[PDB]
Amino acid sequence: AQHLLHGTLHATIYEVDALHETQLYATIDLQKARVGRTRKIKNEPKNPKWYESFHIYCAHLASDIIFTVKDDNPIGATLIGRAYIPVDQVINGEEVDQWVEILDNDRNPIQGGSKIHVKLQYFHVEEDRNWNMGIKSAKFPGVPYTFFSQRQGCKVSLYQDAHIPDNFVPRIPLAGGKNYEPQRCWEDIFDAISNAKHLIYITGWSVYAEIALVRDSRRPKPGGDVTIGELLKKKASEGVRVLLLVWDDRTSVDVLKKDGLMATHDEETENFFRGSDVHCILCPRNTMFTHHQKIVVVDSEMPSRGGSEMRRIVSFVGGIDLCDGRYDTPFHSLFRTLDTVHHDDFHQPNFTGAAITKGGPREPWHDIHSRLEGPIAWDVMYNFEQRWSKQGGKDILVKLRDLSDIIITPSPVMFQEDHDVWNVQLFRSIDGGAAAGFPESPEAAAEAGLVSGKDNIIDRSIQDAYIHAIRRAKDFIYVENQYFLGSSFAWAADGITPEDINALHLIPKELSLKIVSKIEKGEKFRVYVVVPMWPEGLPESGSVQAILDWQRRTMEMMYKDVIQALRAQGLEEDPRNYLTFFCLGNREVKKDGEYEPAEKPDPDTDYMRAQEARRFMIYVHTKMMIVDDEYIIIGSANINQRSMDGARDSEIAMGGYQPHHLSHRQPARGQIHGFRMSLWYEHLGMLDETFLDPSSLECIEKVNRISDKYWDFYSSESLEHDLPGHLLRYPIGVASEGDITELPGFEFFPDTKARILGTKSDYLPPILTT
């Protein structure tokens, strides 16, 4: 630790000249923090040649860049030695190309004097032309070094929950002269599946065949009450190619399942479809990990007022699986839908023995999804094809070249001059064990940002897209995510050895370094983060407690960064006017005519307490980030190592902007702005002029104040009225030095015996919980 490397480190590890079943590889560390490794080379025991290149994202304190040569021989693994390049050598940004001595544990040359050949070049974040500039022109080329390139001529529909009722949204005027109009996710998916004529491809972490997609009696749709299972079986019986890849939840980790973290129905679904014309494949990770992508791909009629007989591809990505517990609206009711839309869809995994017959609260489900049109839709389909080819069933993917006269070649849905147009790019966390067709040669892999893992090539373009989206930010960042933990290389060694945690992804540290850079420049900037009150499961459980502890350490790292920057500027200010954390909750007075359960919970349980207090969190399952009202990422990937790693859970996400609605010379007032405002209206219960510019001090102060008011209403012993909104200040305090503290009287979440600050586990290894 001397030298902050915040930027990108281009590296090539060529070879070891001469070492005087062997599987030789080299790792790259920034001080103690691992940042890359080569593939393993066989049949070259004396002169291993990797010729492997890296584009390493740096946000690290370091004195030495350390290359370790190792042999992963199954009969025994061995350390060959270490080579050191001082950070002084790269800090000025000039290219370094060196043959450096490999040394033993006493820093003496290893036998024979072997040297490793490496090339390095450090690019500080401000060397990037979008650093602190946003997207900054309609000619922005996309995120570099990714497998999928940015697509033009696209259209994205943004979905706020599974469903939205009639006339929900206030008037949110947009640059083109109309008001923002919310789209409805499961109505649209129902239509997409019902109208497909050639293919329906679905992936899910969980699929439940017995749910209906359409349930709003005020917005009925013909056939909308059919279950998704009966709908898919009908379409397949008519000849549509219906292919599902559902995570093999038979491989779950028992301890996580028992704690409530894996409430899935994939196996049940496979039994539902076998014998039908639906091809439902149970897909193991290849477990400790899961297949977490949530995908729907269909053929759809080509936009054409008169009609073209032709078809195009349309794809959905985001957080919402087609399973139990996901249907909801921004009302997020705890008790008042138990005899309507949740009577047969009661989801509450946070109490032992929760059941509709014992009453609510159910767990409301806040989530975000998207529909993708234009060439990007084929990229999602290509992901499905890669996975099916590797882990699917028979050779029954639709062959798009045999259908050139039926399904168009990948094509835009709008002209690039149309201000509604989107530029969209697809990102993933997946590896060669799960997806066929990645390039084998190191040069081609590096051009796509693919990195070597222990045994497979790795796509980590989701983490890369997040890093890039944060670095170009200039006004504000708004995050909703199921998890918020990581950058453990920069955690305090406070009762832990940080290097043992291995939650190395950069998102939390990039956020705090971005905040620090703006403070240093005296430029206004705000970061808003909405997380669930606790991650789904029994909150007293080892798993949930471990996650809250990781979350606490992550928050503490960031606030210490912020406070240190404020103090260096001579500022004494509340760091929560720079970085602010929220969760969501609801609370409903018992009005006449509500569902009356036949039974009750046991007398001194979380369940009984929550039922009597009439309150519960609204679960934040979203995985979305909005930057500057101009760029948005929506997908399946949580802000944790499980999602960001690349070789842990498989994930997918899109990142997009409208090139004519950027935040450059005018405020961004396109679809992303409309959506962000619609989300804020849902959570705050109101819109206010100050919310138009979330970088302002007046905005964050007002949002924070409202969220404190709602926490007071939520957590009070007394209840007179429904909660007027849902956004709660996350129930922690920030000490003057950045330590996260309990609130007075709230060691535990309301109605629970669960510590808000969490508990480090002595049994669960961090690989399971990070």
Q: How far is the CB of 681 from Ca ion (least distance, A)?
A: 11
Which residues 98-157 are close enough to bind Ca ion by CB under 5 A? none
Smaller CB separation from Ca ion, 122 or 159: 159
Among the candidate windows 329-337, 351-359, 503-511, 516-524, which touches Ca ion by CB under 5 A? 329-337
Q: Total residues contacting Ca ion (rule CB under 5 A)?
A: 3
Q: How far is the CB of 364 from Ca ion (least distance, A)?
A: 8
Yes or no: say if 191 and 451 are a contact pair by the CB < 8 Å rule. Answer: no
x/- letters, 279..318, toward Ca ion (CB under 5 A): ----------------------------------------
Q: How far is the CB of 753 from Ca ion (least distance, A)?
A: 28
Q: How far is the CB of 678 from Ca ion (least distance, A)?
A: 10
Smaller CB separation from Ca ion, 161 or 324: 161
Instruction: Say if residue 682 carries a ligand binding annotation.
Output: yes
Q: Is the dihedral of CA 234, 236, 239, 240 positive or negative?
A: positive
Instruction: Say if residue 366 carries a ligand binding annotation.
Output: yes
In whole angstroms, give the CA distance from residue 236 to residue 230.
10
In whole angstroms, give the CA distance from residue 453 to residue 435.
14
Smaller CB separation from Ca ion, 161 or 187: 161
In whole angstroms, give the CA distance from residue 755 to residue 612.
21
Known catalytic residue at 760:
no
- Does position 326 bind Ca ion by CB under 5 A? no
Q: Which of 372, 362, 277, 377 is nearest to 326 (CA)?
A: 362
Q: What is the CA radius of gyration of the chain?
A: 26
In whole angstroms, give the CA distance from residue 378 to residue 297.
9
Q: How far is the CB of 367 from Ca ion (least distance, A)?
A: 7
Q: How far is the CB of 533 from Ca ion (least distance, A)?
A: 14
Smaller CB separation from Ca ion, 450 or 530: 530
Q: Which of 52, 64, 71, 161 binds Ca ion (CB under 5 A)?
A: 161
Among the candidate windows 149-157, 159-167, 307-315, 527-535, which touches Ca ion by CB under 5 A? 159-167
β-strands 619-620, 365-366 pairing: parallel
List, in order, residues 6 or more apart from 317 with CB less than 8 Å away.
Answer: 293, 294, 295, 369, 370, 372, 380, 426, 634, 635, 636, 652, 653, 654
Instruction: Say if residue 369 carries a ligand binding annotation.
Output: no
Residue count (the chain): 770
Which residues 222-251 are close enough to bind Ca ion by CB under 5 A? none
Known catalytic residue at 88:
no
Q: How far is the CB of 682 from Ca ion (least distance, A)?
A: 5
Residue of 248, 259, 266, 299 marked active site: 299
Q: Which of 161, 172, 461, 516 is nearest to 325 (CA)?
A: 161
β-strands 579-587, 727-729 pairing: antiparallel
Q: How far is the CB of 184 from Ca ion (least distance, A)?
A: 13
Q: Which of 276, 308, 615, 647 is nearest to 454 (CA)?
A: 647
Known catalytic residue at 621:
yes
Known catalytic residue at 455:
no
Structure tokens at 462: 């989701």
Residue of 524, 621, 661, 673 marked active site: 621
In whole angstroms, give the CA distance from residue 669 to residue 75.
61
Smaller CB separation from Ca ion, 330 or 410: 330
Smaller CB separation from Ca ion, 38 or 707: 707
Residue of 294, 342, 347, 726 marked active site: 294
Yes or no: say if 731 and 715 are a contact pair by the CB < 8 Å rule. Answer: yes
Smaller CB separation from Ca ion, 438 or 680: 680
Q: Which of 384, 358, 330 is nearest to 606 (CA)?
A: 358
Tokens 């996350």 label which residue? 730
Among the candidate windows 121-129, 150-158, 363-371, 628-636, which touches Ca ion by CB under 5 A? 363-371
Known catalytic residue at 216:
no
Q: Which of 201, 232, 212, 156 is nearest to 326 (CA)?
A: 212
Q: How far is the CB of 587 from Ca ion (least distance, A)?
A: 16
Smaller CB separation from Ca ion, 366 or 669: 366
Residue of 292, 518, 524, 661 marked active site: 292
Q: Which of 7, 204, 260, 330 binds Ca ion (CB under 5 A)?
A: 330
Structure tokens at 632: 């948005």
By beta carbon distance, the residue nearest Ca ion is 366
Breaks in the chain, after residue numbers (C to N greater than 2.5 Å): 20, 286
| β-bridge mates for residue 179, sequence order | 173
Known catalytic residue at 233:
no
Tokens 């330590």 label which residue? 739
CB atoms within 10 A of CB 106: 5
Smaller CB separation from Ca ion, 60 or 366: 366
In whole angstroms, give the CA distance from residue 197 to residue 273.
19
x/- letters, 364..393, toward Ca ion (CB under 5 A): --x---------------------------
Q: Is the dihedral of CA 327, 593, 712, 739 positive or negative?
A: negative
Tokens 């101009």 label which residue? 630
Residue of 70, 509, 623, 683 marked active site: 623
Residue of 628, 629, 649, 751 marked active site: 628
**Using CB atoms within 10 A of its CB, is residue 494 exposed (0-12), middle (13-18) or buried (19+)?**
exposed
Q: Which residues are annotated as a binding site for a 1,2-diacyl-sn-glycero-3-phosphate?
A: 292, 482, 621
Q: Which residues are annotated as a binding site?
A: 161, 292, 332, 366, 482, 621, 682
Which sequence positions are flagged as catalytic? 292, 294, 299, 621, 623, 628
Q: Which residues are annotated as a binding site for Ca(2+)?
A: 161, 332, 366, 682
Positions that interact with Ca ion (CB under 5 A): 161, 330, 366
